[PDB]
Design an enzyme around this catalytic site. Sequence first.
Site: not given
Length: 149
Positions: A16, A89-91, A97
Amino acid sequence: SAELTPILPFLFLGNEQDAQDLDTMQRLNIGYVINVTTHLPLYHYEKGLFNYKRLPATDSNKQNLRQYFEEAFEFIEEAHQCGKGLLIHCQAGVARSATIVIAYLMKHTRMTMTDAYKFVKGKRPIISPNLNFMGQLLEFEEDLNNGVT
């Protein structure tokens, strides 16, 4: 340099906070963003600078990511063939990802799954464990060695 992590010259992996650094996106020539979450914004959307794709994965032990692989690869290849980068992207832990980047590596660079994983982990050492994602990747590997993806 950038918590944003290069995997290939046109492919980068982040969390993130990584995807919120605009200066870094631009100096790396990233033109594309894949956001592997249902709830996060498309960061920088209203600058009208990037091509975006949401993969709306959730917090789940049963999240299916395979169903998105092909869509993701097409967006990656789109970036690639036009000479731009893609940030996926993710977290924190980048498990969603990372899964998609490893799958991209296995299909388009012929890397074994364990080799693909080692490549990414050598570049981004914090990859959270999702046994369900790993089982999907192993399934994908079997499918690629039989010719039926």
